Amino acid sequence: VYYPKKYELYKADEVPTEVVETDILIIGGGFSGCGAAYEAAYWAKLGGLKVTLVEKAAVERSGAVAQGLSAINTYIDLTGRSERQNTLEDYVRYVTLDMMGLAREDLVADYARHVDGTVHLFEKWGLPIWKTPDGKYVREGQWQIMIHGESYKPIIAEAAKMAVGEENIYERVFIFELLKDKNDPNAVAGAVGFSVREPKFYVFKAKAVILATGGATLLFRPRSTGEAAGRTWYAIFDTGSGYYMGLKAGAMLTQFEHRFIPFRFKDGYGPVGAWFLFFKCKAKNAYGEEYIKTRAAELEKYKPYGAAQPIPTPLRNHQVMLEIMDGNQPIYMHTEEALAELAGGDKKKLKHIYEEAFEDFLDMTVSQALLWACQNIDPQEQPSEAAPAEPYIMGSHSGEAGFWVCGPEDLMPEEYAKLFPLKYNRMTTVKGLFAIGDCAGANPHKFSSGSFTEGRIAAKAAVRFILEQKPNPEIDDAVVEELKKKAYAPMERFMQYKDLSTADDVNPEYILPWQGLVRLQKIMDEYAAGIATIYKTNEKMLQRALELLAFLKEDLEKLAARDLHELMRAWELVHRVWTAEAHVRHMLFRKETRWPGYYYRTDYPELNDEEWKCFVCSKYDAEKDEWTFEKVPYVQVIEWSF
Amino acid sequence: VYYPKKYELYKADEVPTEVVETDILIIGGGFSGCGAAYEAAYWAKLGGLKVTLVEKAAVERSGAVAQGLSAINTYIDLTGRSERQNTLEDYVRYVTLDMMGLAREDLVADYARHVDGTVHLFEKWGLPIWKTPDGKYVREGQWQIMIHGESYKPIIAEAAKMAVGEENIYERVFIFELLKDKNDPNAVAGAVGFSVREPKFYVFKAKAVILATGGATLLFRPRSTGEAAGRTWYAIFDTGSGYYMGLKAGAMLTQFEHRFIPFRFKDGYGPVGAWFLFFKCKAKNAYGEEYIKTRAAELEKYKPYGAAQPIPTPLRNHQVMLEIMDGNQPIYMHTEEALAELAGGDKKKLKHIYEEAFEDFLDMTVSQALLWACQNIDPQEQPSEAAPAEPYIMGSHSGEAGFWVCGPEDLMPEEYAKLFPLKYNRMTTVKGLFAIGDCAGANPHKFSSGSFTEGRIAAKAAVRFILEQKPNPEIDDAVVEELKKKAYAPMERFMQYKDLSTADDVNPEYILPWQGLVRLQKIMDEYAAGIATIYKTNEKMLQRALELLAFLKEDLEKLAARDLHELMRAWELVHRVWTAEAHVRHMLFRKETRWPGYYYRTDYPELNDEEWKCFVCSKYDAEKDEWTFEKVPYVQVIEWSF
Amino acid sequence: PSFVNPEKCDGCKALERTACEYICPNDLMTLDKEKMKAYNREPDMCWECYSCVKMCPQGAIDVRGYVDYSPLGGACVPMRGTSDIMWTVKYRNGKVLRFKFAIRTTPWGSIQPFEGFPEPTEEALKSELLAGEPEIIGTSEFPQVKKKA
Amino acid sequence: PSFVNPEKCDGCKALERTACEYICPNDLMTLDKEKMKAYNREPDMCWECYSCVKMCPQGAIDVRGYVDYSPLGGACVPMRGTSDIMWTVKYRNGKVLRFKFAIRTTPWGSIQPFEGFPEPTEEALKSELLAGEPEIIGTSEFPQVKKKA
Ligand SMILES: Cc1cc2nc3c(=O)[nH]c(=O)nc-3n(C[C@H](O)[C@H](O)[C@H](O)COP(=O)(O)OP(=O)(O)OC[C@H]3O[C@@H](n4cnc5c(N)ncnc54)[C@H](O)[C@@H]3O)c2cc1C
Ligand SMILES: Cc1cc2nc3c(=O)[nH]c(=O)nc-3n(C[C@H](O)[C@H](O)[C@H](O)COP(=O)(O)OP(=O)(O)OC[C@H]3O[C@@H](n4cnc5c(N)ncnc54)[C@H](O)[C@@H]3O)c2cc1C
Ligand code: SF4
Ligand code: SF4
Ligand code: SF4
Ligand code: SF4
């Protein structure tokens, strides 16, 4: 709910337009966007190209890493700088198995061969990495290293700023739609946005556009619906903007049915990675049963996924869901037993790991430490409850939802190159349009380091694209004007109909952003495998979801906004609604349950490797208002065996 | 969420006190309260007794019947005034079987032998009852008769006003606590309240007090958490006030674990009674299966309850829950097939039944008709989705939670009279304190007619009690002043700590009523068999609930209020929290699952007639802050067989 | 939830009481002394009972379905009289339905609570009989119920 | 969510920009021009990331746990420096914990983005190598990955 202190209303015709011409436009200044700005600045010099970074908030703390992070979740270690070295083939196998067999290995192997360099730069720039007495990076699990990352984002922001230049960074500018080439329906030409600090409409003209908006949250109703609706596990700041603008432009999405359900500390959603992998914490149900063991049998049916080590995350979730369905909650993270066993009676050792435990929270999810403080929970004395949150859509973490993007020339097979008019690394099916981080699908487990890395890869590819193809798209002024009118339409609608009611938020002719969002969350929660049905859905429910989303999309044309802040909220809602629609259509298309633990199709409860071991790709045609789906069979690109 | 336009603050010592002396005080002017006011006025003349009715809102439309009702759910018909005559023995059997074997038959048989007279008076007073051409009351099901009841409450309000006199009715006065006899720790002496229209503290001194506050809603998180949190199926106006003040006074509760889960039209919660019983509508899952058929065998384990006719409502809910857990939603009420079948090709007949169908909604739950309008649902063309709402606690409807009350001397067995110091009909274990309607437990299915009737019963008993025992309660002025300070404490706390933050609703030293309510709803939903777990719970979850309720209860001492409206909201929250605790403790005590469909104890999944065919009664001792539970074995009072 | 139409609301002219504020069962309707116009002060606590709508003499109150599940466009408008009530239901798609139901068979304010009842007596006070019984029940005598043998 | 202490907040009137308004990732912190003091304009959209808390030069901002699940009394207070950050965790029961963690090993604003890197060339632009590679990866040669036969 939002109650503005006062009005801040503008009509489109009274808002001045500021045109910005650039060669490479990066939308979003988070981890992937900063990686793109950094790398682009290096290669751009070859053609005196201009690089522009636009961020809706402030790069210093914007995005998922606002609080910092307690570990870098992707560090291969090909030389032995950490406690555990790994190989690239082992990593690719690991990601494919976690995805229950479906991952673009050309894209995964690609960011993986580059990621360690990024991490090394991060340390060189000042990021303090946990080290052993021998000077080795401290491992959390097999692929992550612990960091003192409270300032992780500010450090990366500084690197990007020094690289591209402050004059090329536009903050507090919300991008709501892309612009396409007037003379080419499948080529990008720029983007439009508006300031949230003053009345100013932005028209960005670019040869290449890189989507780095982060994923999408608040599509589903959370387990807390009051103030705590703000406590989404994933970044509340990311509302599926990239997904919306890219899909509207005609860029194909892939694996959009692949949501991520995070099992974390209850309510605050503090991390469990360190507790599980580093502190060797055990998770048990209300009756002290360690379900990863008692529910081991249930995973045998999944071959070979059920016998993989580590067990794929969705299957780990599935064991948890079975306990929940049986009503064996609360589920506990036995931190008290973990700390006692690790300390081994050494009080000084206890104090040390105790401090490490609190840093794991204070460096990234302070709310959990605050929750413990408010509830008088001392981790060395009593266990904490854990629970799976509502669904989130993103492609950089354990979820792989995002745009279907091109891979590197040396790794991408012909099988995966078919839909790309131009074969540039990380370019979408729309020429000149790239997608990175959460926006790039089918190549998950990138996390902070991998996202920054993917941004670097797309950036170099964008420079190469511009110098080789010498793109020169032309925006359509008529469309720009129509979009400028749309941009501020919510404010004009408020002014036009507010007099129908003595209450600004109870009007028969418009819905405010928070009102449309509550509605979206309810629809998704009840019909799209949300928490309401313990992540279960079926064809009928999904079809009803589309019907209800249709009503909501029509009502978006009647959105109202009272100030710039709410105008942004209005478009963030628009972005989520279309993201939600794509998610529903993707879940509806795939007739199987490949990721039990993330979602279950009760009408197709089994995993089908006979006809569904394929990526599901879709395209939305705005002119025809039609969605088309196709199956792209998975092919093993990298050498590995189970 | 509440955002007051302006402050309305008062300090306890600035508020004038109004002392009201009466003989019989009725708290709550809904259906049971009006029934008590009506009857009390008749017998009071014997001693020139003063009868006082206090209502927080306005009697004309206050309570569950604010929109009216489409039927009178309890009309035995012992002469043949309706399409179907019934016997009292059959009715008592029906209610006991619906309660899965647990009902105070002395109390049920008692209101049943009186209810028809009340209905006949209602018609006399102007209520239009549906009639057949032959002049017979139109039956809905076996026990209900259809009515044109839009003005059902106003008509009843007039009867009560005419009987007791407007000078004896206090409106817009919220009662928050009872007063006990200074001369006797287990005797009532009156009650205290405050006006919500002006700064005025009320002290009601009485010889007899009758609790008629209605049940309790919004204890659990609803299926809609935005504006629609207001669309509770049961009366949102009833917040467990009677339960709170009565239990605090030491009056024993019974069957407080027995919540009611209403299966109604989804979201709007329109009625299904007429559709099922009158229109012969079928409910089918997403695949077209009529689950009362496919799930019939699953009730075989509940012999002989599963063989009853009609089938016990909780068991009907159980069948629904099984469908929901299997993922067979949406569940549809096939109104289109019902209307077509009933009309039989007769277009004029269709028009007639179509008007009847809409009246069924417009006469009691307009929101459902509005929902259809907004969603373009025409019942003659397409079916509607149905679903079970969150739990509600009341004793007049299908739920039997309430106070343990005394029955008539001619029906109550010695087995049930043991806990009453004085044997007066509907008196609680606290001398002089009576409970009626939703406030009287163990005798459900009273509904509108039965609640009014129960009020009449208690009112006559109250007059008898006064004239026979001749009580002369003395209020403790010291306690009264303590309560006066507590009454406005929230306003004084707001003024005292608001300066700690630039935002009135984000303060570290206090919570606002809506904030505490969101918290209560989350706790009950997640741990007390709410919708979150498909109504499942266990010992551990319930125990954790008590822990979280303990924190909340302590925080109630830090409640803040910005105006009189919010001050009432603060106390309504206080009332709900204690009601919630009692409910949790009751569910924790009963180690069995007797009402699957309403709630499931996953740790004690079976119905236990060997050890739990008893009423669970409890008493809260405010001085020692201790809860004591007792099991009162059920005894069959009325003659009947399965 | 309910909402007041500014153009029709007159803050209840010179009458003795504000209708909407007076009738609301949840104390939601109140006056903005500045505008002299009413408003719902806490819409998420509105049961959509339509009491305020029915009692507004200017017909300045309507209901806009809860945003959680209500697409825009639907409306239910009552015109409550003395013996009946008329309803107009307008669908989002333009469809319009009209109904009319009875609400009372006698004049308002005509109830005589104990009409025809004998006076109460101390002896009667000790029986199970309520006012008007057993006559009002319609049976030949006070209803008897068989006790379990 | 975050909340501002009126006593400590000076509206950043002695600074070129409002710190909290500038830093908030969700655009929640803004100034009440009347009081010239900040406030969280939409608390239910607060991620409790503590960015505003850490960047307020007056230490006027604190966080009060979401009411949905937070009993009153708890607090986490940071004191962020240049090379480390200190935290004080205060429990509802009064217990107080103190921690101190490093946050940066180099001076702020000292990053030289391409330090040591050779100049980009058109020939290099066509390879799979990113700036500083392959050496920044720790290997003399670009990492190879076995393709499946
Ligand atoms: C609670 C949590 C725990 C995690 N734990 C770990 C961990 O321990 N280690 C690890 O390595 N990784 C972890 N990650 C993952 C990591 O943070 C991501 O993988 C990474 O930040 C994704 O980068 P991004 O660029 O895709 O999104 P972000 O970094 O979120 O950036 C997106 C940017 O786009 C902006 N933006 C959005 N919409 C618009 C618009 N319309 N116009 C302009 N700008 C816009 C945002 O404001 C933000 O600046 C975690 C994330 C969260 C939220
Ligand atoms: C959606 C719905 C459908 C139903 N359908 C049917 C049907 O079709 N037919 C039928 O016969 N019955 C039906 N009933 C049941 C019927 O309405 C009840 O059984 C009856 O109203 C219960 O009477 P009550 O006196 O216990 O509660 P109510 O009538 O609710 O009255 C309680 C009173 O107490 C007041 N109050 C509460 N707290 C305080 C306080 N602290 N101080 C002062 N006053 C207070 C309330 O404002 C109200 O005036 C239905 C109820 C609902 C909500
Ligand atoms: S009853 Fe109608 S005219 Fe009177 S104040 Fe309310 S809305 Fe305005
Ligand atoms: S519809 Fe009913 S609950 Fe809502 S404001 Fe009007 S009278 Fe009050
Ligand atoms: S940064 Fe601190 S001092 Fe400055 S405006 Fe915000 S709260 Fe006030
Ligand atoms: S804690 Fe974070 S999201 Fe909340 S107001 Fe402060 S900076 Fe914004």
SS3 B275: helix
Structure tokens at A208: 């290449």
Regarding whether B276 and B186 lie in a shared domain, the answer is no
* Pair type for strands A69-72 and A614-621: unpaired
- Residue numbers in the known binding site of A for FAD are 31-32, 55-56, 62, 64, 71, 73, 175, 241, 396, 438, 447-448
Distance CA A238, CA A442 (A): 19
Number of domains in chain A: 3
Task: Give C 9-28 residues with CB within 8 A of chain A.
Answer: 9
Residue A285 is given by DSSP the state: -
User: B214: CA distance to ligand 2 center in Å?
Assistant: 5
- The secondary structure of A72-140 as a DSSP string is ES----SSSSBS----HHHHHHHHHHHTTT---HHHHHHHHHHHHHHHHHHHHTTPPBPB-TTSPBPBS
Cβ atoms of B573 and B517 within 8 Å: the answer is yes
Longest distance between any two alpha carbons in chain A, whole Å: 74
Distance B31 CA to ligand 2 centre (A): 6
CB contact set of B213 (below 8 Å; sequence gap of 6+)? B27, B28, B30, B175, B238, B240, B241, B242, B243, B438, B439
Ligand 6, closest atom to CA D47? 3
* A367 falls within a domain: yes
Q: How many CB atoms lie within 10 A of CB B307?
A: 12
3-state secondary structure of B169: strand
Closest CA to D86 of A359, A372, A360, A350: A359
Q: Is the CB of D58 under 6 A from ligand 5?
A: yes
CA D52 to ligand 5 centroid distance, Å: 8
Q: For position B95, which CATH number holds?
A: 3.50.50.60
Q: Name the domain boundary from B392, B416, B451.
A: B392
Catalytic annotation, pick one of A130, A233, A571, A595: A233
Q: Give the burial string for C47-74 (b: 16+ CB within 10 Å, else e).
A: bbbbbbbbbbeeebbbbbbbbbbbbbbb
Contact assignment for B551 to D71 by CB distance below 8 Å: yes
User: D39 and B515 in contact by Cβ < 8 A?
Assistant: no
Our answer on whether the CB atom of D38 is closer than 6 Å to any ligand 6 atom is: no
Residues A221 and A254 reside in one and the same domain: yes
Counted across chains A and C, CB pairs separated by less than 8 A come out at 58
Let me know whether B131 and B245 are in one domain: yes
The span from the CA of A620 to the CA of B318, in Å, is 42
B503 in contact with chain D, both atoms CB, cutoff 8 A: yes
Please indicate if any CB of chain A lies within 8 Å of the CB of D126: yes
Distance CA A92, CA A572 (A): 34
Contact C71 A507 (CB under 8 A): no
Name the structure determination technique. X-ray
Integer Cα distance of A175 and A575 in angstroms:
11
Q: Which of A265, A484, A469 is nearest to A383 (CA)?
A: A265
| Tokens read off for A606 | 């089994």
Q: In this structure, are B372 and B400 located in the same domain? A: no
For residue A148, give both structure tokens: 């003192």
Respond yes or no: is residue A73 known to be catalytic.
Answer: yes
Of D8, D1, D6, the residue nearest D26 (C-alpha): D1
3-state DSSP percent of chain A in helix, strand and coil, to 5: 40, 15, 45
Resolution of the determined structure in angstroms stands at 1.8
- Identify whether residues A91 and A218 lie together within a single domain: yes
Asked if A407 and A377 sit in the same domain, the reply is: no
Q: Measured over all CA atoms, what is the biggest interatomic distance in chain D, rounded to whole angstroms?
A: 71
CA A58 to chain centre: 18
Is A140 annotated in the active site? yes
- Domain-embedded: residue A586: yes
Residues of chain A with C-beta less than 8 angstroms from the C-beta of B551: 375
Do B153 and B61 meet the contact criterion of CB atoms below 8 Å apart? Answer: yes
Query: CB–CB of B366 and C49 under 8 A?
Result: yes
Q: Which residues does chain A have within 8 Å of residue B226's beta carbon, measured at their own beta carbons?
A: 1, 514-515, 518-519, 522
SS3 content of chain D, % helix, strand, coil (to 5): 15, 25, 65
CATH number for the domain that contains residue B340: 3.90.700.10
CB contacts of C2 in chain A (<8 Å) are 506
Please say whether the beta carbons of A248 and A614 come within 8 A.
Answer: no
- Kindly state whether C4 is in contact with chain A, defined as any CB-CB distance less than 8 angstroms: yes
Shortest CA gap C16–chain A (Å): 22
The kind and range of the H/E element at B370 are helix B366-374
Q: Which of C111, B110, B385, B559 minimizes the C-alpha distance to A548? A: B385
C residues 61-120 closer than 8 Å to B (CB): 63, 65-76, 78, 80, 85, 87, 89-93, 95, 97, 99, 101-106, 108-115, 117, 119-120
Residue D29 CA, closest ligand 5 atom number: 6
- Distance in Å, CA A40 to ligand 1 centroid: 19
DSSP string, B240-259: SHHHHHHHHTTPPEESTT--
CB contact under 8 A, B540 and A329: yes
Backbone Cα Rg of chain C: 23
Contact across the interface for A565 and D85, Cβ inside 8 Å: no
Nearest 10 degrees: Cα torsion C28, C31, C35, C40: 10
Given a contact cutoff of 8 angstroms between Cβ atoms, the answer to whether B102 and B89 are in contact is no
In sequence order, what DSSP letters do the residues of A4-55 get, joined into one string?
Answer: -SS-----GGGSPEEEEE-SEEEE--SHHHHHHHHHHHHHGGGTT--EEEE-
CB contact under 8 A, A515 and B286: no
Check CB contact of A515 with chain C, cutoff 8 Å: yes
Q: Cα–Cα distance between A211 and A458 in angstroms, integer? A: 10
C-chain CB neighbours of B114 within 8 Å are 130, 133, 137
The answer to whether residues B247 and B339 belong to one domain is no
Which domains, and CATH codes, for chain C? 1-66 (3.30.70.20), 67-149 (6.20.260.10)
* Chains D and C are in contact, defined as 3 or more C-beta pairs closer than 8 angstroms: no
- Among B392, B409, B442, which residue terminates a domain? B392
- Nearest ligand, CA C49: 4
Which chain D residues contact residue A636 at CB under 8 A?
148
Cα–Cα distance for residue pair A564/A569, rounded to 1 Å: 9
Q: How far apart are the two ends of chain D, measured CA to CA in Å?
A: 55
Nearest CA in chain A to C61: A501
- Residue nearest atom 4 of ligand 3, based on CA coordinates: C12
Same structural domain for residues A118 and A221? yes
Is residue B69 in some structural domain?
A: yes
* B314 prior amide bond cis, ω within 30: no
Closest ligand (CA of C12):
3
Please provide residue B374's backbone torsions phi and psi, each rounded to the nearest 5 degrees. -70, -30
Whether B501 and chain A come into contact, CB under 8 Å, resolves to no
C45 within 8 A of B236, measured Cβ to Cβ: yes
DSSP code of residue B137: B
The verdict on B313 and B444 lying in the same domain is no
D51 pocket-lining for ligand 5 (C-beta < 6 Å): no
Two tokens, residue A228: 């705590």
Nearest ligand for residue A217 CA: 1
Q: A468-473: which pairs have CB atoms within 8 A and are 24 or more residues apart?
A: A469/A422, A471/A187, A471/A207, A471/A208, A471/A431, A471/A432, A472/A207, A473/A180, A473/A181, A473/A182, A473/A183, A473/A184, A473/A187, A473/A188, A473/A189, A473/A190, A473/A206, A473/A207, A473/A432
Give the helix ranges, DSSP H, for A507-538: 513-527
The enclosing domain of B537 has a CATH number of 1.20.58.100
Q: What letter would DSSP give residue B312? A: P
Query: B504 C-alpha vs ligand 5 centroid, how far in Å?
Result: 17
Q: Say if B2 falls within a structural domain.
A: no
Helix (H) or strand (E) segment spanning residue C76: strand C75-80
Shared-domain flag, residues A48 and A175? yes
Q: Which ligand is nearest to the CA of C55?
A: 3
> Across-strand partners of B317?
none
- Residue of A501, A538, A546, A606 for testing the chain B interface, max B β-carbons within 10 Å: A538
Q: Which residues have CB under 8 Å from C124's CB, separation 6+? A: none
Domain boundary, last residue among A345, A363, A392:
A392
Statement to judge: residues B265 and B304 lie in one domain: yes
Give the domain extent around A563.
487-607
Longest alpha-carbon distance in chain B = 74
Could you tell me the CA-to-CA distances from B417 to A106, C125, D27, D29 in Å, in that order? 80, 21, 65, 63
CB pairs under 8 A between A and B: 83
Element (H, E) at D37: strand D37-40
Calculate how close chain C gets to A254, using CA atoms only, in Å: 30
Q: Which amino acid does the sequence have at D66?
A: Y
Rounded distance between C-alpha atoms, residue A442 and residue B147, angstroms: 61
Q: Which residue of C has its CA nearest to A517?
A: C68
Find the angle CA(A541)-CA(A542)-CA(A544) to the nearest 5 degrees.
65
Residues B39, C130: C-beta atoms closer than 8 Å: yes
DSSP state of A275: I
Domain for residue B461, yes or no? yes
Report which secondary-structure segment, H or E, holds B158: helix B152-164
A346 CB-near residues (< 8 Å, 6+ apart): none
Q: Are A64 and A31 in contact (CB under 8 A)?
A: yes
Residue A5 lies in a domain: no
- Provide the angle, in degrees to the nearest 10, between the axes of the packed helices B564-589 and B241-248: 70
Angle at B59 between CA B58 and CA B60, to 5 degrees: 95
Establish if A461 belongs to a structural domain.
yes
Residue B211 zone, left/alpha/beta (φ > 0; ψ -120 to 50; rest): beta
D99/chain B closest Cα distance in angstroms:
23
Is residue D123 within 8 angstroms of chain A, CB to CB?
no
Which site among A329, A385, A504, A547 would you substitute to test the B interface, given the most B Cβ atoms closer than 10 Å to its Cβ? A329
Residue C24 and residue C40: Cα distance in Å, rounded? 10
Taking a C-beta distance cutoff of 8 angstroms, is the pair B329, B323 a contact? yes
Q: Quick check: C68 and A554 CB within 8 A?
A: no
Q: Answer whether residue B42 is part of any domain.
A: yes
Rg of chain A over Cα atoms, rounded to whole angstroms, equals 24
A520: nearest CA partner in chain C: C68
Residues A306 and A429 in one domain: no
